[PDB]
Design a protein around this ligand. Structure first.
Ligand SMILES: [Mg+2]
Ligand SMILES: [Mg+2]
Lengths: 413, 413
């Protein structure tokens, strides 16, 4: 089977591109917009529509494979590739990539995905978002050629012999950490709710008092609203390094605090993402390692999730190799080629580290379907409901895909 | 090409099932939920998760056709089929419909969809939501068999010879008619923002003064926030019969008021949905017809959009035949078979009535893709961004699909 044509179309996403640098220099929050001058290259307003590029690969038999290029909300921010405007990157795909795809035989996903993930143009690597979208489309093309699901392709190529089953779905609340929780409970999210605890005094509390009350609140809310008594989701709260800040990265003090949080969450299990966020990757690894070591040694059944400083596949392996947390966030859009997602998850699995197959609110429905398949194929510990901030839409997209995939796999089981 | 298997899976939607009867009786508020007893059979809470059923048709060549069964937010309310719980309706499909599909050769869409739309079980018609899903799947199967888009199938079968072009996308704000407007301007919705003007005193104003200010606000907001100068959307505001109430259904007074609204909207064009909502279908047709006649007679370039009392295909024809408004809302989930959407749109067009290809916030990403194809095929005047209330997600789903469809059709021009 070959690819006979390649089409790219500009699109929207579940959210916005925001000029994070400008916001930090004082941009005006006004309704759902930001007023003021931009600071980051490429931005014409401080908040702009998020953009995607749909990459369609027409196969010889007339089927059409589909992936979507997309980037994070803070596209173009520090350490990121440039602002991902379709009008700027469509021409790159059309001129430099499409000709290497047209006429190409569809064989196995892994070598093809790796080739495009690493491809250069004028000696420079491709924008992460392009690699994301092109490899998604390649995955779909292999699946469509073999007449199986994307999950089955990945399982075959990265997790041979494994069953494909459902994976818990994690929903994120943003700042609306009360009403969005109600949504999550009603929609039966398996893991919730992120809660955006990104300020020490205002959100955590100086000595963690506010977060402690929040956990209590969330516990009681679940019990109050759940439709069935056996609905018992897992708490996952991102503190953006505030626990480290509140407690001067004192391993014992942090452990003591987290212990009280876990006691308050009972009977729900607790995962804390980003407890500390220190000054370099090495010391982040050490602090996560040692904090996990302390909690485990105490028999405190609360898990730590790595995020800050753990970005690339090499980072994932580093954090895994040093048991630096219990779970590692696999940052789908940032990894470029989706093959990297599979390699990262499989490394964690082989080495006893939990893998959280993540994402962004600024990606698309299609990219979410694709990465959800990969997560299922690799046996991720959780996948993110995405994209968007409405909660309902992201949960629908990911969970409905998951169920359909499981039904189709079941026909060949 | 034959269908060789049929699979059904339960799923989520972009919103909730709400017990409208209990809400009308005075159910109280508690964060995002409602308090009090349910009133409608089938509900276990006043607000519960919306549900879908994915219908998968496996084709002889291994391709998989997919439609989603879904219903409105107020499922099971007065005049509607029972609360659409997947567990209650998956068995009906599995036992009564799947055997009639398995083994069937895929030919044209129209005869097959009509057969399934009208099929009875135990002498009774099927739930609208099942018809909706099954016919979507049949459409996808014809498209997959012919190796063209769903839009092309419908065009060929209902609108032969016509060009398939982009259709204006309408987005709905819900009660947050200010911040969601910003989202719509940033995402460049072609028509906006619905605004949920559903209370005389609080939203319209006793003499329409509040809505007048809102129109002026919207006009100015678009001009302030638009990224490009040539962004000129159409205003579409739903007044839930409140103009009728505020002015005692007096034709002259309603026209005078709407004329002031249109002047205030300049330079943007204004559509008012549901100006009056009177006691029966005949009187609703008459009031819409006479209000239009008066506005057109005065040369006021404002449009009326029918909704209340205009539900079935027969109703659409009735409002069309009598020029009862300038545009009719084609209520996709409520018409059952998606073949009825095409027939309804085509009737409107033949008769010079605008066709608004609607939907619900409580359907799915897939159902939205499918109905968007139908709207494009038939040259609808607008299509609804859907599902969900996040706005972003609905805009993405519908607009991304439209763009991709256009690119794929462009290969066969
Ligand atoms: Mg984090
Ligand atoms: Mg209406």
């Amino acid at each position: 089977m070959k690819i006979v044509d390649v089409l790219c179309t500009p699109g929207l996403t579940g959210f916005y591109f925001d000029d994070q640098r400008a916001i930090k220099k004082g941009a005006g929050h006004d309704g759902f917009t930001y007023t003021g001058s931009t600071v980051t290259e490429g931005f014409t307003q401080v908040r702009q529509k998020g953009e995607s590029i749909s990459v369609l690969l027409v196969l010889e038999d007339g089927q059409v494979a589909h992936g979507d290029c997309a980037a994070v909300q803070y596209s173009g921010a520090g350490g990121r590739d440039p602002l991902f405007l379709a009008k700027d990157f469509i021409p790159v795909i059309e001129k430099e990539i499409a000709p290497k795809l047209i006429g190409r035989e569809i064989t196995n996903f892994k070598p093809m995905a790796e080739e495009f993930d690493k491809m250069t143009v004028n000696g420079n690597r491709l924008h992460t978002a392009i690699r994301y979208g092109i490899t998604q489309a390649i995955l779909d093309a292999v699946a469509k050629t073999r007449k199986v699901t994307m999950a089955e392709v990945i399982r075959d190529e990265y997790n041979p012999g494994a069953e494909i089953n459902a994976v818990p779905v994690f929903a994120q609340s943003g700042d609306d950490r009360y009403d969005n929780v109600d949504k999550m409970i009603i929609k039966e999210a398996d893991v919730l709710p992120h809660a955006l605890i990104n300020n020490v005094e205002e959100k955590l509390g100086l000595k963690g008092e506010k977060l402690l009350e929040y956990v209590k609140w969330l516990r009681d809310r679940i019990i109050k609203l759940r439709v069935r008594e056996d609905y018992a989701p897992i708490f996952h709260i991102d503190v953006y390094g505030t626990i480290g800040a509140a407690f001067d990265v004192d391993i014992k003090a942090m452990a003591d605090y987290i212990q009280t949080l876990a006691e308050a969450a009972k009977p729900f299990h607790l995962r804390i993402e980003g407890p500390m966020d220190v000054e370099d990757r090495q010391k982040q690894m050490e602090a996560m390692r040692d904090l996990r070591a302390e909690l485990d040694g105490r028999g405190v059944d609360a898990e730590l999730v790595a995020d800050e400083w753990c970005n690339t596949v090499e980072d994932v392996k580093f954090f895994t190799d040093n048991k630096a947390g219990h779970m590692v966030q696999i940052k789908t859009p940032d990894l470029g080629g989706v093959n990297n997602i599979a390699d990262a998850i499989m490394y964690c699995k082989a080495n006893g580290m939990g893998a959280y197959c993540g994402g962004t609110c600024n990606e698309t429905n299609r990219s979410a379907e694709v990465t959800t398949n990969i997560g299922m194929a690799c046996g991720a510990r959780q996948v993110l409901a995405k994209p968007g901030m409405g909660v309902d839409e992201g949960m629908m997209i990911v969970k409905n895909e998951m169920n359909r995939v499981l039904a189709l796999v079941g026909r060949r089981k």
